[PDB]
Amino acid sequence: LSDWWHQSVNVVGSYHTRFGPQIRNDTYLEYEAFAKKDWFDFYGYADAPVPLFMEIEPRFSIDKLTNTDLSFGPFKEWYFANNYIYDMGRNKDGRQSTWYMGLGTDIDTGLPMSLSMNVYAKYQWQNYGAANENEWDGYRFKIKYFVPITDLWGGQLSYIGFTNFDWGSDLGDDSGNAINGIKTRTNNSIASSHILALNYDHWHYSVVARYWHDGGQWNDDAELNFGNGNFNVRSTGWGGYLVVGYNFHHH
Ligand SMILES: O=c1ccn([C@@H]2O[C@H](CO)[C@@H](O)[C@H]2O)c(=O)[nH]1
């Protein structure tokens, strides 16, 4: 229902993406959905070519469900938080199923913005045949914030930022070394996103600057050779996205 459940279909063009071994620039369709209903809030998206990648973020209110104002300090509410990533891949081989679960919260900064924090433990299933499949591996700290800027060009300009800090993974330790000498993978990783979004009644535009540090836990500069000659991984650095979409809702 339009009241709480918000949907959108978008077209996305990316440039200098860094989640994998080699840089990528892709375009694709995307389904988005956000929701907030007393005991549960949710965000997620599914991406598909010009096979299927989806990431959901469902959280459940410990307060609401426990029916016990756990409020404290700047912490308005507490949640059983989840960040689950699924990549179907072209082979049941090169696919991924990642489940982050933990404690989350909403901070009240007394400023005209929203700020949330979450820490998760993770269990890995498929991971493109990597060394850390099927086992509990690594942790993640997710910090995201929403800040309404102003009205611009007839629409509402706002800013969105969120970052995913990953550490404690055993990958990298358990992976080989590169032609390069240094290790191929990484025990940790950071993916920070900065978004400038223009929203009209239905259509919306967003520019996204994203910075990676050992993207996809690929140790930056690792020298590999996939059968076309040697090359160097560029997992640390910037990349960006352009997103145009349409949000549905009956008047
Ligand atoms: O953890 C993630 C999150 C996003 N993406 C890529 O970035 C696109 C949009 O975020 C997704 O379709 C996916 O390919 C990843 O590779 N890994």
Short mmCIF file of C-alpha atoms and ligand atoms in Angstrom, two decimals:
data_model
loop_
_atom_site.label_atom_id
_atom_site.label_comp_id
_atom_site.label_asym_id
_atom_site.label_seq_id
_atom_site.Cartn_x
_atom_site.Cartn_y
_atom_site.Cartn_z
CA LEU A 1 0.00 0.00 0.00
CA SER A 2 1.17 3.48 -0.99
CA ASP A 3 0.91 4.55 2.67
CA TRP A 4 3.92 2.56 3.87
CA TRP A 5 5.15 0.37 0.99
CA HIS A 6 7.02 2.40 -1.65
CA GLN A 7 8.08 0.95 -5.00
CA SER A 8 10.13 2.11 -7.96
CA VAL A 9 11.59 0.86 -11.22
CA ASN A 10 14.79 2.52 -12.38
CA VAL A 11 17.42 2.43 -15.08
CA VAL A 12 20.99 2.53 -13.83
CA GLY A 13 24.24 3.24 -15.54
CA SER A 14 27.42 2.65 -13.57
CA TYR A 15 31.04 3.56 -14.13
CA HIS A 16 34.22 2.19 -12.56
CA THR A 17 32.46 -0.17 -10.16
CA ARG A 18 34.77 -2.02 -7.78
CA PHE A 19 33.09 -5.06 -6.20
CA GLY A 20 34.95 -7.53 -8.48
CA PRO A 21 38.52 -8.35 -9.79
CA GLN A 22 38.15 -6.19 -12.88
CA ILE A 23 36.57 -2.77 -13.19
CA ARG A 24 33.08 -2.66 -14.62
CA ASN A 25 30.67 -0.13 -16.10
CA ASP A 26 27.18 -1.51 -16.56
CA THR A 27 23.62 -0.49 -17.19
CA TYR A 28 20.56 -2.32 -15.98
CA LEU A 29 17.00 -2.26 -14.73
CA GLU A 30 16.25 -2.08 -11.03
CA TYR A 31 13.35 -2.62 -8.68
CA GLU A 32 13.40 -0.73 -5.39
CA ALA A 33 11.21 -0.91 -2.33
CA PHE A 34 11.27 0.91 1.00
CA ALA A 35 8.87 0.42 3.90
CA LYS A 36 8.26 1.44 7.54
CA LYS A 37 5.43 0.00 9.64
CA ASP A 38 5.53 0.34 13.44
CA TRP A 39 7.43 -2.90 14.16
CA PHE A 40 9.40 -3.20 10.93
CA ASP A 41 11.30 -1.08 8.41
CA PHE A 42 12.72 -2.35 5.14
CA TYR A 43 14.79 -1.41 2.16
CA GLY A 44 15.93 -3.52 -0.73
CA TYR A 45 16.57 -3.60 -4.46
CA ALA A 46 16.87 -6.06 -7.35
CA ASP A 47 19.06 -5.45 -10.39
CA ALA A 48 18.74 -7.12 -13.77
CA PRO A 49 20.66 -6.81 -17.10
CA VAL A 50 20.06 -4.01 -19.61
CA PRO A 51 20.95 -12.03 -14.58
CA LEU A 52 19.70 -11.19 -11.10
CA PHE A 53 21.34 -9.41 -8.12
CA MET A 54 19.33 -8.40 -5.10
CA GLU A 55 20.09 -6.92 -1.71
CA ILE A 56 17.52 -6.60 1.03
CA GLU A 57 17.72 -4.87 4.38
CA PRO A 58 14.88 -5.92 6.63
CA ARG A 59 14.88 -4.84 10.28
CA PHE A 60 12.54 -5.75 13.13
CA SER A 61 11.91 -3.50 16.11
CA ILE A 62 13.01 -5.14 19.33
CA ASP A 63 11.13 -2.37 21.13
CA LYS A 64 7.83 -2.85 19.31
CA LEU A 65 8.00 -6.63 19.43
CA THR A 66 9.28 -6.72 23.05
CA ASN A 67 6.82 -3.95 23.81
CA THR A 68 9.44 -2.38 26.07
CA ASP A 69 10.70 1.17 25.42
CA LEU A 70 14.38 0.27 25.05
CA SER A 71 14.97 3.91 24.18
CA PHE A 72 18.12 5.38 25.68
CA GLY A 73 20.35 8.37 25.04
CA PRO A 74 20.25 9.38 21.34
CA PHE A 75 19.09 5.85 20.59
CA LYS A 76 15.40 6.08 19.70
CA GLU A 77 14.82 2.42 18.86
CA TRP A 78 16.64 -0.93 18.64
CA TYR A 79 16.36 -3.57 15.91
CA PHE A 80 17.14 -7.12 14.91
CA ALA A 81 18.90 -5.99 11.72
CA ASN A 82 19.58 -7.92 8.49
CA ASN A 83 21.62 -7.22 5.35
CA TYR A 84 21.24 -10.08 2.87
CA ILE A 85 22.92 -10.10 -0.54
CA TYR A 86 22.11 -12.60 -3.29
CA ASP A 87 23.70 -12.87 -6.73
CA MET A 88 22.29 -15.50 -9.08
CA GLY A 89 25.30 -15.53 -11.41
CA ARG A 90 25.70 -17.37 -14.73
CA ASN A 91 26.70 -20.58 -12.91
CA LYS A 92 25.41 -21.92 -9.62
CA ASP A 93 29.17 -21.67 -9.26
CA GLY A 94 29.82 -17.94 -9.58
CA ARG A 95 26.97 -16.97 -7.28
CA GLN A 96 26.62 -15.47 -3.81
CA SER A 97 24.38 -15.72 -0.78
CA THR A 98 25.38 -13.48 2.13
CA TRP A 99 23.55 -13.05 5.40
CA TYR A 100 24.40 -10.25 7.82
CA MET A 101 22.43 -10.29 11.09
CA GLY A 102 22.87 -8.25 14.21
CA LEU A 103 21.83 -5.35 16.35
CA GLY A 104 20.70 -2.09 14.83
CA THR A 105 19.43 1.32 15.94
CA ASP A 106 18.18 4.77 15.01
CA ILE A 107 20.02 7.80 16.39
CA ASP A 108 18.40 11.14 17.18
CA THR A 109 20.96 13.81 16.34
CA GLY A 110 18.69 16.73 17.07
CA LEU A 111 19.51 17.81 13.51
CA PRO A 112 17.14 17.85 10.50
CA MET A 113 18.23 14.42 9.28
CA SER A 114 18.01 10.68 9.89
CA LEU A 115 20.89 8.53 11.06
CA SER A 116 21.01 4.77 11.61
CA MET A 117 23.70 2.35 12.76
CA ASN A 118 23.98 -1.47 12.64
CA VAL A 119 26.54 -4.18 13.43
CA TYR A 120 26.21 -7.64 12.02
CA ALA A 121 27.74 -11.08 12.25
CA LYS A 122 27.79 -13.02 8.99
CA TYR A 123 27.23 -16.48 7.64
CA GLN A 124 28.53 -17.13 4.12
CA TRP A 125 26.94 -19.57 1.69
CA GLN A 126 27.91 -19.30 -1.99
CA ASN A 127 30.59 -16.73 -2.69
CA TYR A 128 31.77 -17.31 -6.21
CA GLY A 129 33.62 -20.39 -5.02
CA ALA A 130 35.79 -18.32 -2.71
CA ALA A 131 37.64 -19.73 0.33
CA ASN A 132 35.10 -18.51 2.85
CA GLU A 133 32.00 -20.26 1.58
CA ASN A 134 29.63 -21.99 4.00
CA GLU A 135 30.88 -20.82 7.36
CA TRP A 136 30.41 -17.96 9.74
CA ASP A 137 32.73 -15.25 8.45
CA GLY A 138 33.42 -11.57 9.10
CA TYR A 139 31.37 -8.74 10.54
CA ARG A 140 29.85 -5.55 9.23
CA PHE A 141 29.13 -2.08 10.52
CA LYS A 142 26.57 -0.19 8.44
CA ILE A 143 26.01 3.49 8.98
CA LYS A 144 23.46 5.32 6.88
CA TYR A 145 21.96 8.76 6.93
CA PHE A 146 19.30 10.77 5.11
CA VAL A 147 19.41 14.57 4.88
CA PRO A 148 16.72 16.66 3.21
CA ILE A 149 18.44 19.57 1.46
CA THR A 150 15.94 21.85 -0.31
CA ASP A 151 13.58 22.16 -3.24
CA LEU A 152 15.31 22.50 -6.55
CA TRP A 153 13.87 22.66 -10.04
CA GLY A 154 10.34 21.91 -8.90
CA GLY A 155 11.49 18.81 -7.06
CA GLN A 156 12.94 17.93 -3.66
CA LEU A 157 16.72 17.68 -3.52
CA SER A 158 18.12 15.49 -0.76
CA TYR A 159 21.26 13.68 0.23
CA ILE A 160 21.85 10.10 1.18
CA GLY A 161 24.93 8.47 2.56
CA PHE A 162 25.68 5.01 3.91
CA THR A 163 28.84 3.00 4.41
CA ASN A 164 29.58 -0.65 4.88
CA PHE A 165 32.66 -1.49 6.95
CA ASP A 166 33.65 -5.13 6.73
CA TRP A 167 36.28 -6.71 8.89
CA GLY A 168 37.25 -9.96 10.55
CA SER A 169 36.77 -12.07 7.46
CA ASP A 170 39.19 -14.98 7.17
CA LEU A 171 39.32 -14.65 3.38
CA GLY A 172 42.61 -13.22 2.18
CA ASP A 173 44.28 -15.22 4.93
CA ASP A 174 42.91 -18.37 3.33
CA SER A 175 43.41 -17.29 -0.28
CA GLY A 176 46.56 -17.43 -2.33
CA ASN A 177 49.02 -14.71 -3.25
CA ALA A 178 49.21 -12.76 -6.50
CA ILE A 179 51.83 -12.90 -9.23
CA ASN A 180 52.34 -9.55 -7.59
CA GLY A 181 53.69 -11.05 -4.35
CA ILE A 182 50.99 -9.49 -2.16
CA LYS A 183 47.93 -11.51 -1.15
CA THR A 184 45.04 -11.73 -3.58
CA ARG A 185 42.12 -11.26 -1.18
CA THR A 186 41.22 -9.22 1.89
CA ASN A 187 40.06 -9.81 5.46
CA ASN A 188 38.21 -6.54 5.34
CA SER A 189 36.69 -3.94 3.02
CA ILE A 190 34.89 -0.61 2.82
CA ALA A 191 32.21 0.64 0.46
CA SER A 192 31.05 4.19 1.11
CA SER A 193 28.22 5.76 -0.88
CA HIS A 194 27.25 9.41 -1.39
CA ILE A 195 23.96 10.20 -3.08
CA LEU A 196 22.38 13.34 -4.46
CA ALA A 197 18.73 12.70 -5.27
CA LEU A 198 16.06 14.86 -6.98
CA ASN A 199 12.50 13.70 -6.32
CA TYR A 200 9.34 14.71 -8.10
CA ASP A 201 5.86 13.30 -7.55
CA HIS A 202 6.87 10.16 -9.47
CA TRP A 203 10.02 10.58 -11.48
CA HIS A 204 13.35 10.90 -9.77
CA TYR A 205 17.01 11.35 -10.60
CA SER A 206 20.06 10.43 -8.52
CA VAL A 207 23.79 10.83 -8.90
CA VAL A 208 25.89 8.42 -6.89
CA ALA A 209 29.55 8.66 -5.97
CA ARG A 210 30.91 5.48 -4.42
CA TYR A 211 34.33 4.81 -2.97
CA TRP A 212 35.79 1.39 -2.33
CA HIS A 213 38.73 0.23 -0.26
CA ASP A 214 39.60 -3.31 -1.30
CA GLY A 215 36.29 -3.72 -3.10
CA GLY A 216 34.69 -7.11 -2.71
CA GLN A 217 37.61 -7.89 -0.48
CA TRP A 218 39.90 -7.85 -3.45
CA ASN A 219 43.28 -6.74 -2.22
CA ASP A 220 44.03 -3.60 -4.22
CA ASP A 221 46.86 -3.88 -6.73
CA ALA A 222 46.99 -7.66 -6.58
CA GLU A 223 48.52 -8.85 -9.87
CA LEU A 224 46.50 -11.58 -11.56
CA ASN A 225 46.25 -13.25 -14.99
CA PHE A 226 42.94 -14.69 -16.14
CA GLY A 227 44.33 -15.86 -19.47
CA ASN A 228 44.72 -12.59 -21.33
CA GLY A 229 47.90 -11.38 -19.74
CA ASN A 230 48.79 -9.91 -16.40
CA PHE A 231 46.71 -7.12 -14.92
CA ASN A 232 46.38 -5.30 -11.62
CA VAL A 233 43.34 -5.14 -9.40
CA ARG A 234 41.97 -1.64 -8.75
CA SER A 235 39.74 -2.34 -5.74
CA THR A 236 40.40 0.98 -4.03
CA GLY A 237 39.08 4.15 -5.60
CA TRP A 238 35.99 5.89 -6.91
CA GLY A 239 33.21 4.87 -9.21
CA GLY A 240 29.75 6.28 -9.67
CA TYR A 241 26.19 5.69 -10.73
CA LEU A 242 23.45 7.59 -12.57
CA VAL A 243 19.92 6.52 -11.68
CA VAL A 244 16.61 7.52 -13.26
CA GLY A 245 13.42 5.88 -12.08
CA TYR A 246 9.74 6.15 -11.32
CA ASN A 247 7.99 5.63 -7.96
CA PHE A 248 4.42 4.29 -8.09
CA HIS A 249 1.45 5.33 -5.94
CA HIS A 250 -2.27 5.85 -6.50
CA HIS A 251 -3.31 9.48 -5.98
O1 LIG B 1 27.36 -5.79 -1.96
C1 LIG B 1 27.08 -5.44 -3.11
C2 LIG B 1 26.17 -4.38 -3.46
C3 LIG B 1 26.06 -4.00 -4.73
N1 LIG B 1 26.77 -4.60 -5.72
C4 LIG B 1 26.62 -4.26 -7.12
O2 LIG B 1 26.16 -2.92 -7.25
C5 LIG B 1 24.88 -2.92 -7.96
C6 LIG B 1 24.02 -1.82 -7.40
O3 LIG B 1 24.42 -1.55 -6.03
C7 LIG B 1 24.31 -4.30 -7.69
O4 LIG B 1 23.47 -4.62 -8.79
C8 LIG B 1 25.56 -5.20 -7.66
O5 LIG B 1 26.05 -5.64 -8.89
C9 LIG B 1 27.67 -5.61 -5.49
O6 LIG B 1 28.31 -6.12 -6.43
N2 LIG B 1 27.78 -6.00 -4.18
#
